[PDB]
């Protein structure tokens, strides 16, 4: 399979394609303020310092808040517009692919400022799924086959 003992060959083509498609998405809302305690009001503002969590063995000085539904994240992005001094301390909201975060790396639904909404702190020391990418993998039989 490695030696150069093979016949003159010239006609390679993209024969087949398999792909592990990212079908659904998840979101980390990573901000520097403890979303789940008192903000206050415009005239009397409070700024709850971010606790910090630890995922994949990296301590974050920030809070990482989980969402697996856009609407869920939208409701909170909206609730946040009414507090520009808490919203001021968002680093980003990142869009990751689904099924990479372990359930037992997530706190249960704790309420937001008041709150009517719930957000799930992501920490609990745990790691991500070191995902076996199967849609794209071919075992021997399946490879020779394809």
């Amino acid at each position: 399979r490695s030696n150069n003992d093979v016949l003159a060959t010239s006609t390679m083509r993209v024969h087949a394609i398999k792909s592990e498609l990212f079908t659904q998405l998840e979101y980390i809302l990573t901000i520097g303020a403890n979303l789940r305690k008192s903000f206050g009001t415009a005239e009397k503002p409070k700024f709850p310092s971010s606790s910090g969590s630890t995922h994949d063995g990296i301590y974050n000085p920030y809070d990482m808040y989980w969402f697996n539904d856009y609407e869920s994240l939208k409701e909170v992005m909206d609730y946040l517009t009414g507090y520009p001094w808490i919203q001021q301390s968002i680093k980003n909201v990142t869009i990751i692919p689904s099924g990479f975060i372990k359930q037992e790396s997530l706190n249960d639904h704790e309420p937001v400022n008041g709150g009517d909404l719930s957000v799930r702190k992501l920490g609990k020391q745990g790691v991500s799924n070191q995902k076996d990418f199967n849609a794209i993998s071919l075992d021997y039989q399946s490879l020779m086959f394809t």
Binding site: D56, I58, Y59, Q130
Partner: protein, 114 residues
Amino acid sequence: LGLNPINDKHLLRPNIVTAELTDYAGNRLPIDLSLIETNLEFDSFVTMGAKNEIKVYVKNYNARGNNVGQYIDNALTINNFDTIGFSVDAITEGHVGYAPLFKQDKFGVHLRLG
């Protein structure tokens, strides 16, 4: 290497056996086994605290011993160490490097004998 040590020393040559160090972070060190006179000994040159950097070399590589060979001019050099972020009333951030590797028990220097 499954080489008979008694009369196969002449087979420690690159197109029969190959040695490479890696930290699984792209820092690598290729090794040409025809140059170690008798021993694949790894020693290191680490400076710490003030400046954090471990470079691990191969003893008397390419040398006609017992002078040192390439010494540290042929070394796998490690220094992307993790720092950790904290909070104060700023939020000054931590730096990530070998951390998630370590939570897989792969933070370390590895040798690939081929």
